[PDB]
């Protein structure tokens, strides 16, 4: 459609149509310039071979060296070089949410979850795969002595130790080649409560 729209605008000029005011496309049900919730959230289940590729730069799907709270930088798409903080991380599809205003995109809301008075289209933060982002961490420059932000291209796990009684796991992450152990981000543990039925 973008191939047909670019040509139409080039030929018509002052008669360029107002496509934003047209009806939805029945082939998919989306408005103009609007994505689908499945495509804006990337809720599609991918192959297990694809999951291993999305985190090839940050270890393995079961040994993941990126956590929510890390500042990453986009390296693909229109919003390249955009730096943001991770809010949530989905390990099923290996996607990540960066609540940045520039990453918002129009989305067609389905009607089974919308009142007759609400607007059909809305703007929501778009998810990205982990392969399209890289970690941004400040490292101390040894010769100058000042701290500047750098982009980490690769991460690997280190000092892995399991606890069979508790079925827990604690390890560290470092940058290969330079061997710089990067601390984990401050994560808040889930709040466990005692219910009356317990």
């Amino acid at each position: 459609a973008a191939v047909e729209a670019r040509n139409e605008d080039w030929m018509l000029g002052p008669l360029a149509p107002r496509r934003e005011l047209d009806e939805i496309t029945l082939s998919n049900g989306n408005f103009f310039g609007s994505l689908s919730p499945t495509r804006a959230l990337l809720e599609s289940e991918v192959s297990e071979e694809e999951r291993k590729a999305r985190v090839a730069w940050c270890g393995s799907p079961k040994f993941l060296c990126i956590a929510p709270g890390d500042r990453v930088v986009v390296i693909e798409g229109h919003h390249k070089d955009l730096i943001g903080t991770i809010e949530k991380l989905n390990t099923r599809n290996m996607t990540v949410e960066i609540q940045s205003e520039k990453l918002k995109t129009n989305t067609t809301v389905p009607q089974f979850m919308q009142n007759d008075a609400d607007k059909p289209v809305t703007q929501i933060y778009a998810r990205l795969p982990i392969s399209s982002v890289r970690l941004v961490h400040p490292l101390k420059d040894p010769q100058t002595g000042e701290y500047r932000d750098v982009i980490i291209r690769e991460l690997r796990p280190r000092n892995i130790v399991h606890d069979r009684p508790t079925r827990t796991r604690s390890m560290r992450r470092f940058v290969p080649g330079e061997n710089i152990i990067i601390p984990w981000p401050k994560q808040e543990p889930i709040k466990r409560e005692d219910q009356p039925a317990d």
């Binding site: 047209d22 919003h79 389905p110």
Partner: protein
């Protein structure tokens, strides 16, 4: 958010999807930014559209580079002229509308398309309202939908008020033309929308019905669906096309009594 993956979740997961839409509605909220959204909630900011309106900038940039070079090769040519098609696209409005799938056949709907062919939208709508055909009700509905997209998206039929003042106040004579079929018309509003082209197309098979016949024979009957495509234009097109047919007839020269018809056979001698 799928229709089926919406009830198999907990209210905890479902309430967070409602909270996400709530914070999104608050962020969207006098006139400077009010123009950045449509009545349907589509944000007209480049950042929110670039992923759908400009999905492949690597190719659009190279395609534009092609059209720019093609335009300078014509600007440096002293003998270049704007092609006829490129001149009509930027001067004459047009809407190509394809209807939905109607429960009928091509042999049946072809006759309703040929009826509204060449007529104005107002004339065609009146003929569909008083037609004994069952699809005439569908054609009328689809023709009203097409006229709505022609007015909102293309800007057609938006000079009626300015037309009447131009002629009725001035007291001038409107334009008189003659269509390709020879029908004479007197156009007072050059923006009036009319059915320029119309054709029917075959669609997917509605269903299959088994015809059980004598001697234990069974035949499959196909229930058809068909679509109609209408091209709506303004009367400016019929005026231009008429002025061209007139100029072509005036360019063919007059009839002469003694024409200099050529002798086609060549022989290496004189026969007279």
């Amino acid at each position: 958010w799928s229709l089926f993956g919406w009830g198999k979740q907990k209210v905890e997961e479902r309430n967070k999807v409602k909270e996400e839409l709530k914070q999104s509605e608050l962020a969207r909220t006098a006139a400077a930014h009010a123009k950045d959204q449509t009545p349907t909630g589509i944000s007209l900011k480049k950042d929110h559209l670039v992923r759908v309106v400009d999905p492949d900038p690597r190719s659009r940039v190279r395609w534009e580079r092609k059209m720019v070079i093609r335009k300078l090769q014509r600007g440096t040519d002293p003998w270049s002229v704007e092609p006829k098609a490129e001149r009509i696209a930027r001067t004459e409005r047009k809407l190509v509308y394809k209807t939905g799938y109607l429960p009928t056949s091509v042999k049946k709907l072809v006759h309703l398309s040929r009826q509204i062919r060449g007529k104005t939208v107002s004339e065609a709508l009146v003929q569909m309202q008083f037609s004994k055909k069952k699809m005439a009700k569908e054609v009328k509905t689809e023709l009203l939908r097409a006229e709505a997209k022609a007015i909102v998206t293309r800007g057609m039929g938006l000079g009626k008020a300015a037309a009447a003042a131009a002629q009725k106040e001035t007291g001038a004579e409107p334009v008189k033309i003659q269509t390709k079929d020879g029908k004479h018309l007197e156009i007072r509003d050059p923006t009036r929308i009319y059915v320029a082209e119309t054709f029917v197309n075959k669609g997917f098979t509605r269903g299959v019905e088994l015809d059980y016949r004598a001697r234990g024979r069974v035949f499959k009957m196909n229930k058809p669906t068909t679509t109609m495509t209408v091209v709506l234009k303004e009367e400016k097109t019929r005026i231009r096309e008429h002025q061209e047919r007139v100029a072509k007839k005036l360019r063919q020269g007059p009839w002469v009594h003694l024409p200099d018809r050529p002798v086609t056979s060549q022989r290496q001698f004189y026969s007279w």
